[PDB]
Design an enzyme around this catalytic site. Structure first.
Site, PDB file in Angstrom:
ATOM      1  N   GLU A 124     -14.071  -1.336   5.153  1.00 59.37           N
ATOM      2  CA  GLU A 124     -14.438  -1.390   3.742  1.00 59.37           C
ATOM      3  C   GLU A 124     -15.851  -1.939   3.597  1.00 59.37           C
ATOM      4  O   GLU A 124     -16.150  -3.052   4.046  1.00 59.37           O
ATOM      5  CB  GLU A 124     -13.413  -2.230   2.962  1.00 59.37           C
ATOM      6  CG  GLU A 124     -12.020  -1.588   3.012  1.00 59.37           C
ATOM      7  CD  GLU A 124     -10.878  -2.579   2.867  1.00 59.37           C
ATOM      8  OE1 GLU A 124      -9.763  -2.139   2.506  1.00 59.37           O
ATOM      9  OE2 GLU A 124     -11.092  -3.785   3.106  1.00 59.37           O
ATOM     10  N   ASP A 138       0.887  -1.173   0.000  1.00 61.56           N
ATOM     11  CA  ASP A 138       0.000   0.000   0.000  1.00 61.56           C
ATOM     12  C   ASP A 138       0.923   1.220   0.000  1.00 61.56           C
ATOM     13  O   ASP A 138       2.067   1.103   0.427  1.00 61.56           O
ATOM     14  CB  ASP A 138      -0.833   0.048   1.294  1.00 61.56           C
ATOM     15  CG  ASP A 138      -1.970  -0.975   1.335  1.00 61.56           C
ATOM     16  OD1 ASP A 138      -2.675  -0.991   2.363  1.00 61.56           O
ATOM     17  OD2 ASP A 138      -2.187  -1.744   0.371  1.00 61.56           O
ATOM     18  N   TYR A 143      -8.952  -9.674  -1.511  1.00 61.25           N
ATOM     19  CA  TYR A 143      -9.911  -8.678  -2.010  1.00 61.25           C
ATOM     20  C   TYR A 143     -10.601  -9.200  -3.266  1.00 61.25           C
ATOM     21  O   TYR A 143     -10.029  -9.989  -4.021  1.00 61.25           O
ATOM     22  CB  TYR A 143      -9.244  -7.339  -2.321  1.00 61.25           C
ATOM     23  CG  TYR A 143      -8.995  -6.434  -1.129  1.00 61.25           C
ATOM     24  CD1 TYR A 143      -8.462  -6.934   0.053  1.00 61.25           C
ATOM     25  CD2 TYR A 143      -9.248  -5.071  -1.205  1.00 61.25           C
ATOM     26  CE1 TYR A 143      -8.201  -6.109   1.142  1.00 61.25           C
ATOM     27  CE2 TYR A 143      -8.994  -4.231  -0.129  1.00 61.25           C
ATOM     28  CZ  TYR A 143      -8.466  -4.753   1.047  1.00 61.25           C
ATOM     29  OH  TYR A 143      -8.204  -3.925   2.130  1.00 61.25           O
TER      30      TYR A 143
HETATM   31  O1  LIG Z   1      -3.771  -4.148   4.330  1.00 58.31           O
HETATM   32  S1  LIG Z   1      -4.909  -4.491   3.486  1.00 58.31           S
HETATM   33  O2  LIG Z   1      -6.108  -4.845   4.304  1.00 58.31           O
HETATM   34  O3  LIG Z   1      -4.574  -5.630   2.621  1.00 58.31           O
HETATM   35  C1  LIG Z   1      -5.270  -3.037   2.532  1.00 58.31           C
HETATM   36  C2  LIG Z   1      -5.632  -1.795   3.348  1.00 58.31           C
HETATM   37  N1  LIG Z   1      -5.526  -0.526   2.607  1.00 58.31           N
HETATM   38  C3  LIG Z   1      -6.081   0.601   3.370  1.00 58.31           C
HETATM   39  C4  LIG Z   1      -5.502   1.921   2.891  1.00 58.31           C
HETATM   40  C5  LIG Z   1      -6.284   2.854   2.186  1.00 58.31           C
HETATM   41  C6  LIG Z   1      -5.704   4.040   1.749  1.00 58.31           C
HETATM   42  C7  LIG Z   1      -4.342   4.278   2.003  1.00 58.31           C
HETATM   43  C8  LIG Z   1      -3.581   3.346   2.682  1.00 58.31           C
HETATM   44 BR1  LIG Z   1      -1.697   3.659   3.052  1.00 58.31          BR
HETATM   45  C9  LIG Z   1      -4.159   2.156   3.130  1.00 58.31           C
END
Ligand SMILES: O=S(=O)(O)CCNCc1cccc(Br)c1
Length: 658
Positions: free
Chosen positions: A503, A232, A615
């Protein structure tokens, strides 16, 4: 270019098969190709499909093997004790187990190339590793090899790594076949790729898939095109789209819906070793998490995504600041100039940069693309490229100039290091996208922006209302537009969680009745209901019968257009597991018209319970089949980072689910 050995219809039932007499004396030269079509829908924890070994006492570490794990990982070992060589190459999440109930025929091609000193593995048309070594070990050249085995490795007279499965076809060649020749081998894949390594995006990685069926019948997909491995932000990430005009059978070459140019779009092999796998592109702006909806009235398609400037930071950047200044009921994007220690500027009307200390305008303006202009002239910055040439990640200027954007590290004016939401539109159903615009703050000047829920927005059937779910601490925050996304308002819905990645995706159960399913920290998927088209929201309930992990996973959801067993139906797509992101399922729920309760009646296993599933995106295709685009691996696990071509698409019919 013909096989030195060819055989098939082998059943591996915890009993190895000896093919030494057939194969060993045929092996010659130092380059070999193995081609193997096999099924394994009930694998043991760790099993070998194929072994060449020295079976003699004292030589237990002299063998070549092709092995798999019940996690879907594939690998080889290449070991010779006298040479002091112990090679192990592998990649997690490389296999299919089952599709529509039937065992999947995986096509495996392993190329051992003595001339290039390189071992390469392909599964199902996807290269999962390619490794060059200084000291090459031909698989045929292991000291005292005397056994060729299927479904185990013979070490000191015993069956190690016993396999359960079958090898419908196996061929061996005394040559390293070219990448070209590999591509001509027939596959029996249950899936297809929309986005993939080497396509127009030039991202080696993809995450956060979305799917939406447009009214013309065109099916549109968006995704994170992720450049710096699968991390991310911080990284370089663009939002790419592709569409299908034939019910998901074929898909257009991707284009960008949202892109930054501060860093080059590079196809990079991100290191997976423990020392380097957390390397991150650290000075790039990026997008993350896209969502799609279609507006009935204008006919436009709308795509939102989170936006992050290069200066973003995981903790102290920047909650408690929206990045906007409130001035007379209106919100203005704040800006900091190179040299100042505070944000003494704003982007007022027509992108004029104002000095807040003096309230005087400046000679700088911001154009439509968030680019900096001085006296009407386009300022530029030098692009960055990344490499691991020095044995660690470096980010350096590459000689190329690109327009100066307020989201960039090298920009004269920078936005607040925080997360924003952007919106773009397409008037041609995804053939091109406009320049994005930032949405305004919804929770105040001093709240950091909410986080977009990736997947779909909701277009209400009976009105012009558009809704995009977002989340923040303590609530879902729905963004509501009744004017084709020109203006938005929020509708807050409190949830019993602090700092959850909540989410959320919505289905319209009936006219004006929205149910939202969302990710929590409890191990259960939650839901709330609205009966006034999103104005107000019920308290939170939880679904029983599906398990997620403590940290949870995105859930995708649609209202199916057709009755099932005589009732309104909803289909959920989620991992079903309390351990990791695996055991993918489509769960069909039937609505009880008396109370709008949902009876989760059918569970369809996407693949094995132990095989990765994270996802996901689902859509009802125009022919009433179901399209599923999903991360086929554990996208949480620190062992399955930076894998290519794991986001895959499948086609299902309702009868498959029931
Ligand atoms: O870790 S996971 O659950 O696979 C994905 C989580 N993403 C959330 C997010 C949203 C926006 C910026 C940022 Br930085 C992280």
């Amino acid at each position: 270019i013909s096989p030195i050995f060819q055989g098939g219809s082998y059943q591996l039932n915890n009993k190895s098969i000896d093919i030494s007499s057939l194969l060993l004396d045929k092996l010659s030269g130092e380059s070999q190709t193995v081609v193997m079509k096999f099924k394994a829908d009930k694998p043991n924890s760790l099993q070998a499909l194929f072994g060449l070994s020295n079976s003699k006492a004292g030589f237990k570490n002299n063998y070549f093997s092709i092995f798999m794990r019940d996690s879907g990982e594939i690998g080889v070992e290449i070991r010779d004790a006298q040479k002091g060589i112990n090679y192990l190459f592998s990649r997690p999440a490389s296999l299919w187990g089952k599709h529509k109930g039937q065992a999947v025929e995986n096509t495996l091609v392993f190329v051992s190339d003595s001339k290039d000193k390189t071992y390469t593995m392909y599964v199902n048309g996807i290269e999962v590793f390619s490794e060059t070594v200084d000291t090459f070990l031909p698989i045929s050249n292991i000291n005292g090899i005397d056994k060729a085995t299927l479904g185990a490795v013979n070490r000191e007279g015993k069956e190690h790594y016993l396999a359960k499965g079958s090898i419908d076809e196996i061929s061996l060649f005394n040559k390293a076949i070219s990448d070209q020749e590999v591509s001509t081998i027939p596959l029996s894949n249950p899936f297809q790729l929309i986005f993939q390594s080497g396509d127009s995006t030039q991202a080696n990685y993809f995450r956060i898939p979305t799917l939406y069926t447009l009214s013309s019948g065109r099916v549109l997909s968006s995704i994170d095109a992720r450049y710096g491995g699968t991390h991310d932000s911080k990284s370089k990430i663009n939002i790419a789209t592709s569409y299908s005009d034939d019910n998901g059978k074929t898909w257009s070459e991707p284009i960008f819906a949202m892109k930054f140019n501060d860093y080059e779009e590079q196809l990079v092999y991100w290191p997976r070793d423990n020392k380097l796998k957390n390397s991150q592109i650290s000075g790039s702006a990026s997008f993350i998490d896209s969502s799609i909806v279609e507006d009935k009235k204008s006919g436009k398609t709308i795509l939102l995504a989170d936006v992050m400037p290069a200066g973003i930071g995981n903790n102290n950047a920047n909650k408690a600041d929206s990045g906007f200044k409130e001035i007379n009921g209106h919100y203005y994007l704040k800006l900091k100039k190179n040299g100042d220690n505070d944000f003494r500027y704003t982007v007022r009307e027509n992108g004029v940069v104002y000095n807040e200390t003096t309230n005087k305008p400046t000679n700088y303006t911001i154009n439509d693309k968030y680019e900096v202009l001085e006296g009407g002239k386009s300022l530029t910055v030098e692009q960055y490229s990344v490499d691991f040439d020095s044995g660690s990640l470096r980010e350096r200027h590459n000689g190329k100039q690109v327009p100066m954007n307020v989201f960039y590290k090298d920009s004269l004016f920078k936005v607040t290091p925080t997360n924003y939401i952007a919106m773009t539109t397409s008037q041609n159903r995804g053939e091109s996208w406009e320049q994005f615009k930032l949405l305004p703050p919804f929770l105040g000047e001093k709240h950091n922006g909410t986080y977009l829920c990736p997947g779909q927005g909701l277009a209400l059937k009976s009105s012009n209302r558009l809704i995009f779910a977002t989340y923040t601490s303590g609530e879902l925050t729905y963004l509501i537009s009744d004017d084709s996304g020109q203006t938005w308002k929020k509708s807050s819905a409190s949830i019993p969680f602090k700092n959850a990645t909540a989410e959320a995706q919505m289905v319209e159960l009936r006219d004006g009745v929205i149910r939202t399913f969302f990710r929590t920290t409890t191990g259960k998927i939650a839901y709330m209901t609205s009966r006034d088209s999103g104005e107000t929201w019920s308290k939170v309930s939880y679904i029983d019968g599906i398990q997620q992990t403590s940290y949870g996973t995105q859930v995708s959801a649609i209202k199916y257009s057709q009755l099932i067993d005589g009732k309104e139906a909803v289909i959920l797509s989620t991992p079903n597991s309390r351990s990791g992101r695996k055991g993918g399922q489509l769960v069909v729920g039937l609505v009880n018209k008396e109370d709008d309760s949902i009876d989760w009646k059918y569970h369809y296993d996407i693949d094995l319970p132990s095989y990765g599933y994270a996802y996901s995106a689902i859509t009802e295709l125009p022919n009433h089949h179901i399209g599923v685009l999903f991360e086929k691996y554990d996208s949480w696990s620190r062992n399955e980072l930076h894998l290519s071509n794991v986001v895959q698409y499948i086609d299902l019919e309702i009868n498959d689910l029931t």
